[model samples]
Target chain A: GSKSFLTEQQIKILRLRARGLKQSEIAELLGTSRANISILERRALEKIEKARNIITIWEQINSKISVEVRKGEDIFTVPDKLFKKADELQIKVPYSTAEIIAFLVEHAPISDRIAKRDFTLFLDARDRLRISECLLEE
Target chain B: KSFLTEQQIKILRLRARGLKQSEIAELLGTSRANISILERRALEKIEKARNIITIWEQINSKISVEVRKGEDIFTVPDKLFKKADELQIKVPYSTAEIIAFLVEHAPISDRIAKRDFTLFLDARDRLRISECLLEEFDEIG
Candidate 1:
């Protein structure tokens, strides 16, 4: 578990960098010095390298175990199980009904176009279903 | 000389996002009555410049970029990445992913990321998938 060595601060910096924030901005947000932020960011990247190595090792072990203990399961089994579990966890799916309708309106034949009508219908449906607008609340 | 005023341009941008007149008015910190007048004046100016007689014939068009929420990292071809770099644009995984997502979700032309992002998102879907594939190869390889 070499990847597990990443400090919480290092993980926080990595996540922020992944979101496209600048190092200076991250430093300001974290109330840390920019030099310190840079150091942490470098360490975080090293942790990612470690994580990749761990993933490879885990995959090898998983394959070996599956071949011996779970005869029916193979390399795909882990991904399949991961996906199934992710779905079961009810991960909020991101979608914009307005964007979809706008696309259809622009591309579909004029004869088949719904224009604003489709957007209105989608809004009405969302309201009727009482669907929360936010897919995930942080 | 015939360009939109700052407030008018702001309104146009919001309207491009499909905001209603009332919503735009509120966002612009103006009264609804004033907003109606401003819209009318803006339209008249556009008509005079374009020499359009029928107001109804002037179709309003808005530009937008559709972004996909979740996807794997993109692997861009080295050639394309080099081209992007030549254009002073970074072809990192995040940038490639965003461009690919735009192409997948929006009607856009097949193009390298070096091209204008908006135009590239307005024309082709298959090319986007191809680009995504290339990007995936680059990242994973």
Candidate 2:
């Protein structure tokens, strides 16, 4: 479907799941076994995660306020750099310093209050923060 | 927030291409019921995303005007520029550039608007065209 990365079955199962249907309920609706529904739902989530990472990298490419965070650097410092870069363009970041750090703790390659890997942090066109790992392939 | 999951976006696009639930299920090895739920949920996510963006625009965009259906695309730039002037900000796009952007992005065909839309410049001075209309005074109070 329009060069989508997900299979048709995966898309269908995901939609049913999003609608608050239990896996067993969805299986019954489709005349499929509960085990099959579980597998389909798992794979759909895996594919969705990959697609989200790609979108994060894409946002890094287009963002005007990009900063590279070094390995072992405190995640807390990255937000200041992002805010400074945004100031150069007279762009106001909608997120607070704590909010930015919280996002990194959830989404970035970080551990113990420090970055585990070098990554790029940037604010996209929508003023939303995104993280992209410094990897050869997305 | 990315309200729509990847699966939802793909499913919605397929539906937009005129694929029926039964047809899509047949192609994907799922039942029509499963496909039906997917399509319905995808549309709901799209609505959520639109409402979020509209709130963002309201907070950040200062110059916004409703462009009526059947209006000439060529005229939007001047109006936008005039509004930007009132806000004391220079429009980053020129007259011809705005028209080109409208033809490329807006709901326009043959240089005329195909439906009512809103045109605005966001905080960073980038031009945007949205399918949603600006609310009138009657709707506000």
Candidate 3:
């Protein structure tokens, strides 16, 4: 909470240390001695990480965390086979690839995100084979 | 981007818990029209999410399927839900993390997926654990 207790240089040293720069390297980069850098690094890390622990504790108390998926910041990658299948099913003039992907996924029992984790589409032949095998068993 | 905003999700939950449009509107001190609009938007958003899930699974379901052995053949294993309770894995969202983990370890890859001659019967004859394979995996369009 005491933001002014640490100087900007002290914060800078801590930032560099977090990225894994050694005390000697930090001293060279900041044009200071290793001893001075180590002392500041010690001070900054103690304050910052302790403050961070409290934030982590509070965050854990929440059931769900909402994260923004901004369009410009992220891209949705659809499977290549999905595009090919969509081509056979929908007229090209009537739809965008995004729309086609949306259509296939919408009809799918699982969402792409969940499917990516736990589901996979098999070849159409497998479906046929299963039917034939079941018939033979009967 | 997610289909629904946080506020939209909140409204959707209230609607799911059976609060009517007017009730939700009155409880949240919002107009009835806003509740109607929020519910419709949530439906669209949730559908978009489900579509992505369906399409991806269609590309590759590491799951095995079978005809029910007979009428009333299926059993929901009680010990499974018991373990889930012991682990405190209660919510729908955490299940995603669990599924992601299982898929990462499933018998899946381009080489295996393209091995069209082999069926899930062949695959499952070779492994252990019988979880989601029997149920939802086969329902995907």
Candidate 4:
């Protein structure tokens, strides 16, 4: 829990910075260096996210459902749950359940064996893959 | 309006989940009749796009953005945070929004997100994966 802690200074910088104030302006206003602002801001955001345990869509699916490039590698759960509630929206299903999950987790925290299949592809789509950084959200 | 918009496809998917036409219609804030027509249209589009993997891939690329519906804060890697700073993109509040953002204002270029999306679609098709992974749903605005 403490690992995901935010400091008072970090929180202060977060509020002002998020208010659209420029870095140098905030630093000057806050009476500090831009470097301090940047560092504190980054750290604060990270801590907040950690404290909240935020995760990305890919991360969510990876953690919640089992979409790895593993065996069977089949259908999704939530989308499925929302199915009965979706006729009015008129969206269509073109691909199989297995295919949908694979692309999502191709670069997720699945497996070395699985990732090997799409490592280069993930590289091209840098937004898809991640090693330690699990940049996720609400 | 064209190519079975993401909403339509998503509706169709919820249909696949055994959701009723009326239920889906109510949930999405659309009329059931509209959903009926849209679902039919989506069905036709899906059928046509079936063998046309290129079209499917293109659509997938465009809609591959993921959005987290619940939760707060964004946990990112330090390198990427630095990278985001370098790119001058803001750290979005959600995972899906961020990926969506990445797809557009990625450090390299939008070309990569486009190509990257296309590549994922191709792999999914090649591997006979699921449609849900297409990431076809737009983040709830």
Candidate 5:
């Protein structure tokens, strides 16, 4: 027999059933007829079977891969190599507070420096991606 | 604070998924009272981790706060990814794709879909791609 998949409505009915709700109760909650609830449940079970078959196939593939990795034995050493590769990919180490504060003091506009120096240093030290000086009304 | 056993964490996660105590009991093949106890214990473990003084007050105040507002809870360490591999509950689609698909297929009004779909996308973004892939096929034609 060909497998049939559940419609979204049927899936909802099954989920409600899994919650231990009665058919009549589900029908009322869903604003549908009791007969419709029965039909939905029947269709949902058929869909569940189809889903289960897919799951089984994936599990078999996973198990086969697991066995192959175990037999190869050198597969366990991949993590250290992966970590080294990741570290190599990083362009630069993070900046220290002193370096950022000095840079901001030298580069900031002279007039704005007096009032904004501390704030700029704070923002630079924290690597603030975005900061707004604008105030929001409460 | 004591750490939750695997069972307690499972109960908490089910609650997070919006399962009621009665529903969890049926799903786990346990009694309602037992499920209630597990949920209570799970909640306590969560509170203990947060160092919160009052669970009721916290829940009441935090209910209005979005789940996204909370810090990410540390995932339980496992020897191998056993729990994740076993449970295949995660969907595979990215937030944008998921929202696009939801907008396309959802039977609800666009207003409702837009509001709910945004939340769904936010939640999916936090999960690992391996976890999200379980329902990836469903999003496509």
Candidate 6:
């Protein structure tokens, strides 16, 4: 109960806040100060966000199928490269080439269907395609 | 609206505000039936994104356990920690954080589990609580 990252009251405030309750309204309902509600909500969101960042890092380090695309690279060329990476690992991509292309066009940094910037594309352990703008220096 | 069209995103935003499909259709000057299709497609993209996390958890999580209905929610911290010890892992959450997370996210009522569920800590030490049971997988020799 004590020493928790988020207090039970804080969690309740977050749920109500997410569902469109105002902090002043929640403060009155919970018999607390609005300032406390604000602080609690901020802390709760911060902790949850940190957890998400950790998961993102985990995916980056653990994923096996990766392809780096340069700025001005043809978006159509990415799927073939990703497929080759998967083949090297003996992993079967669950998506078709067209699907991978669609995913890149949707999620990657592309301008007029050309890669607008350098980024790495990879499949997480779940085989979902992911794009990252950051990369390690050689 | 990168994954969904802009119109689909607009429909979903209004839908999230508790607007009905027919009401959204009226506002968007579209038929109710067409509004439903747009909403469904937007939801499909959202669900597809969530599935990535679900699959990632399944493949990488090494510590998992089942919690039965009416079980004491407080006891899970020690149980999961025991499993982590067996695998030589340092659990990232404090016991209190674990309890708080479960009460917020899991099928819990007060301190009791209201339904059977599975809880796992992935390789990242991020906690996951699932309504579905964990699937059995063969270990490679």
* Model with the higher TM-score, candidate 2 or 4: 2
Tell me the whole-model lDDT of each prediction, alpha carbons only.
0.39, 0.66, 0.39, 0.42, 0.38, 0.69
Q: What is the per-residue lDDT of model 6 for residues A1-138, given as tens digits with 9 covering 90 to 100?
A: 222133455446554664467988888877889988788877766655443443454455456566789999999988888787776679888999898887887778999778888998877878787876656321
Segments in model 2 whose C-alpha atoms lie over 4 Å from true places: A1-73, A76-138, B1-36, B135-141
Ranking by lDDT: 6, 2, 4, 3, 1, 5
Q: What share of the true interface contacts does candidate 2 keep?
A: 0.00
Model 4 per-residue lDDT tens digits across residues B1-141? 324355765675576557899899987899989998888876664443342333333333311222232212132223334444543434433445444544444332422322222112132422122222222222111
Candidate maximizing TM-score? 6
| Candidates 2 and 5, the one with greater TM-score | 2
Question: Can you tell me the CAPRI class of model 1?
Answer: incorrect
Model 1 spans with C-alpha error above 4 angstroms:
A1-5, A61-138, B1-141
Q: Give me the candidate number with maximum lDDT.
A: 6
Ten-residue stretch with the least lDDT total in model 4 chain A: A118-127
How does residue A76 of candidate 4 score in lDDT? Answer: 47
lDDT of 6 by residue, B63-113 (tens): 777798988998988887877787676777899998888988999888899
Candidate achieving the largest DockQ: 2
State how far residue B10 of model 4 sits from its true place (Å): 36
Backbone clash count for every predicted candidate, in the order shown: 13, 0, 16, 27, 4, 0
**Model 5, B1-31: lDDT tens per residue?**
1344556656665665577888888877889
Interface RMSD of each: 27.5, 14.6, 20.5, 19.5, 19.1, 17.2
Query: On a 0 to 100 scale, what is the lDDT of residue A34 in model 1?
Result: 92
> Residue A54 deviation, candidate 6, in Å?
21
Q: Which stretches of candidate 3 lie over 4 Å from their true place?
A: A1-138, B62-141
Instruction: Give TM-score values for chain A, per-prediction.
Output: 0.38, 0.67, 0.34, 0.42, 0.36, 0.67
Deviation from native of the Cα of residue B16 in model 2, angstroms = 18
Per-candidate DockQ versus the true complex?
A: 0.01, 0.03, 0.02, 0.01, 0.01, 0.02
Docking class of 2: incorrect
> lDDT by residue for model 1 over A1-138, one digit each (tens)?
123344456545654565467888787877889998887777656645434433222222222111111222232233334334446655432334343334334532223432211111111212221111111110
